[PDB]
Structure 1
Amino acid sequence: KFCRFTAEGVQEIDYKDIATLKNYITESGKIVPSRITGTRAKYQRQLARAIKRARYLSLLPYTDRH
């Protein structure tokens, strides 16, 4: 119920692990707020960066309907 990344000690959310990245995007492809997901601010920023890079690399959708 806390930030899983600071629970695990990982300090960067690598954008190549879509299995983790999916946990933090709504089914409509939007990023889930840090309030909802419980992630602390630093990892939320890192997570948003990684999500955006994955969206560029087509590993995640920019949105559900394309």
Structure 2
Amino acid sequence: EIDYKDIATLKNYITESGKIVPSRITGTRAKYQRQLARAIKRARYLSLLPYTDRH
């Protein structure tokens, strides 16, 4: 249902340094949290979100 292409949803789920916010802060479901984790790692290979705030 969730997908890696809608990066605006992924912008709400990362930090300014590209770090993945856990479900403790956002309060999302744990089923989506494993799905959101692998969805960002797909976008991390395709140069869609930065790794760190270094570059």
TM-score (structure 2 length as normaliser)? 0.91
Shift of 1:43: 0.2
Deviation sequence 1:2-52 (CA, Å, 0-9, x none): xxxxxxxxxx32001111111000111100011101111010110011111
- Secondary structure, in 3 states, of the residue corresponding to 1:30? coil
CA RMSD of aligned residues (A): 0.8
| Greater gyration radius | 1
Q: How do 1:20-31 and structure 2 match up within 5 A? A: 20-31=9-20
Q: TM-score, normalised by structure 1?
A: 0.77
For the pair 1:44 / 2:28, whether they are aligned, the reply is no
C-alpha displacement of 1:65: 1.2
Moved over 4 A (4+): none
Q: Unpaired runs of 5+ in structure 1? A: 1-11
Deviation for aligned residue 1:62: 1.1
Aligned partner of residue 36 in structure 1, secondary structure: helix
**Taking every aligned residue pair, what percent have the same amino acid on both sides?**
100
Q: Aligned pair count?
A: 55
